Amino acid sequence: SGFRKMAFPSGKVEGCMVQVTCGTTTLNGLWLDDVVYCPRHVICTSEDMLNPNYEDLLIRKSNHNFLVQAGNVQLRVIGHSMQNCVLKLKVDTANPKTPKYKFVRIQPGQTFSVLACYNGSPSGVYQCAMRPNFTIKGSFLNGSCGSVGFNIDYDCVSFCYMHHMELPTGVHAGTDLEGNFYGPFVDRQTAQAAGTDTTITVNVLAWLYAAVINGDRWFLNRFTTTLNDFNLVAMKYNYEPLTQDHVDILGPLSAQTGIAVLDMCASLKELLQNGMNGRTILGSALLEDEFTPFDVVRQCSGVTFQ
Amino acid sequence: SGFRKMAFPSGKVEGCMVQVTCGTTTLNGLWLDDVVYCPRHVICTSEDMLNPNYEDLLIRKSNHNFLVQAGNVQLRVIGHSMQNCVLKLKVDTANPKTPKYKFVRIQPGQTFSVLACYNGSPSGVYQCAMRPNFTIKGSFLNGSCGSVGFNIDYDCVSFCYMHHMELPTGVHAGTDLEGNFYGPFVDRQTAQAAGTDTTITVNVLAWLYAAVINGDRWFLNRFTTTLNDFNLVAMKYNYEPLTQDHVDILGPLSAQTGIAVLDMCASLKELLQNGMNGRTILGSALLEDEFTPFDVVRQCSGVTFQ
Ligand SMILES: *[C@@](O)(c1nc2cc(F)ccc2s1)[C@H](C[C@@H]1CCNC1=O)NC(=O)[C@@H]1[C@@H]2[C@H](CN1C(=O)[C@@H](NC(=O)C(F)(F)F)C(C)(C)C)C2(C)C
């Protein structure tokens, strides 16, 4: 038992990180086969990013303006292409440490691991969720751009995020590995707002199930409720509406605990309406919404990868 | 900014994990140079662990009773030695993926990363602290024994923990890489209590500093206090006493924020005495004590390793 925010093992991604320099700007890139991916604003300078014309900027730029280093070793760039908000640099050496991999665009409420990197070197790894408003609550300093977020499916790495920016509220925004932002963000230094965040209801439920599984059951009450009625209370607290797809996704946890989703919902309604009363659930004094059902299933079944 | 429980990148340890089998018992071992380390109770069976005589058990045991696998590849064991609560199996192949490494016995209040493993394969990585009472609050299922805890200093891996058991309170216990338990625990299935846990005061302060650094400063009051007076309140809440060594260790954070440790202490005293009032600090509704000053320094400066 016990319950921790767990990240995937980062070994397979660590071998893919490199440093990309264009003039004085340095950030991280991702080296897969003979291609390096990084944010296109590597080609901008720190003090003129208010509203870049990326096309014009990129036009002063040749293959040789791009310094790519993997550890000590410099790579030769033989080709460059802009794709949405990402630059792709063709290099002359396939990464010998390339994992099996794909590129996926994740959905709001899914989780993934971030390998936070500086100057192309790994600093740390943590787990994050794509919020409903397509931000993440990461931990990212200057130099972190180009750090990636991923999942591991057995031996396969699914890359889903590349870091680009921090928004005024101190949350973070970025793209998929095709260069397309999650959310309405753009890669210029301008005031940009995320909308209202909402709680990922299905995640909160999974976490309530994990609680039960771990023996923490104080909050289970003696009521049940309806989807419709639950959803009336959900909406008022800025919880995402629960659908029957959510109910069915929780099926394993439901089955494993013997507690029907709508019972667990009733418990949740009371926690929403009366707060925790200074108690904790799995050591937390707030309702956690950054574990998917899938996450909970695996931390309570021991899923492995390498 | 932002503030996350961050683990070290796990790549260098992932290449060291193997599966160790003795009869029907399987757990994880750590393969460094030509030696595999694992818990000695790999030689016991699931249902007779009430009070093993490890010496007698080990005596029915020969090199060939030990099945060591690294992925598909079986390793040949040419020698075995019991050291305290660990078994050391000499193998005929040096791990080609051995990192630079040392073995350290950590102190209560230090943090480290855990690579939780099953059947010799990595499942996940998270950060943990050695509690004052020498437990950890991990996330560990059946099969997790032999998973290790570590730090990275630049390119060097310092192994500090090997997992052994879960205690009745749902916390976890284990040894250093020499086989010596942290705390008064022993490797038999018997009711065993950890004493009272205490909060790691210096960590809570570092986390208050991280809060300030991130712009979350609501809790800063207009008082100061004395070590002595602070310590009077500390003791009543089961906080570890703060010493001048602690004060001096917080020096970087102190200097970087302009807030003297004893001011921050005064703020902490009020939080202890009046609670948070339903507010949060770095998104938490409790006082976090699992980040060292060192941890905070690095998540707020971008320390890298590979
Ligand atoms: C990342 O590492 C990058 N740094 C640089 C430096 C250059 F010189 C060129 C290109 C890049 S990308 C930055 C990561 C953030 C630093 C602080 N926390 C981080 O996550 N990303 C940026 O600095 C990013 C780039 C320009 C302005 N950025 C921002 O993140 C800024 N935010 C915003 O303007 C907004 F809209 F509020 F989000 C800011 C104020 C620096 C935090 C661009 C968006 C291209």
Ligand SMILES: *[C@@](O)(c1nc2cc(F)ccc2s1)[C@H](C[C@@H]1CCNC1=O)NC(=O)[C@@H]1[C@@H]2[C@H](CN1C(=O)[C@@H](NC(=O)C(F)(F)F)C(C)(C)C)C2(C)C
């Ligand atoms: C680990 O993976 C191991 N499993 C086995 C299985 C065998 F057949 C032989 C040896 C081993 S070591 C176990 C990890 C725990 C399982 C549940 N959560 C875990 O962290 N470790 C043990 O099962 C451990 C070993 C015997 C009894 N152990 C306990 O952890 C038990 N706790 C206690 O008895 C005490 F004192 F309360 F702590 C228990 C009740 C199974 C959780 C020994 C201590 C050698």
